[PDB]
Amino acid sequence: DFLSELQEGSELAEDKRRFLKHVEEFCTRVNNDWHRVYLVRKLSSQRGMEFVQSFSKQGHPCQWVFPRKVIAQQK
């Protein structure tokens, strides 16, 4: 919900930023990337597939929501 708010609008008041930072640390700490597959399915559910396609560019500061193989093998 915060990421769907993030693409639509502005900065998130320094505490939602910390929560998304903790989600980033959680997903980069554990290799349980099924929850990351769930994350991309939820972001595809709330907005659409082209939403995470727009996330899947080359310097967007939300790249950590994608696993390591889907980005290096994407043209």
């Binding site: 595809s44 559910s45 709330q46 659409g48 939403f51």
Partner: peptide, 9 residues
């Protein structure tokens, strides 16, 4: 509708 965004499209 209780679908995804893509699925409602």
């Amino acid at each position: 509708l209780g679908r995804s965004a893509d699925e409602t499209i």
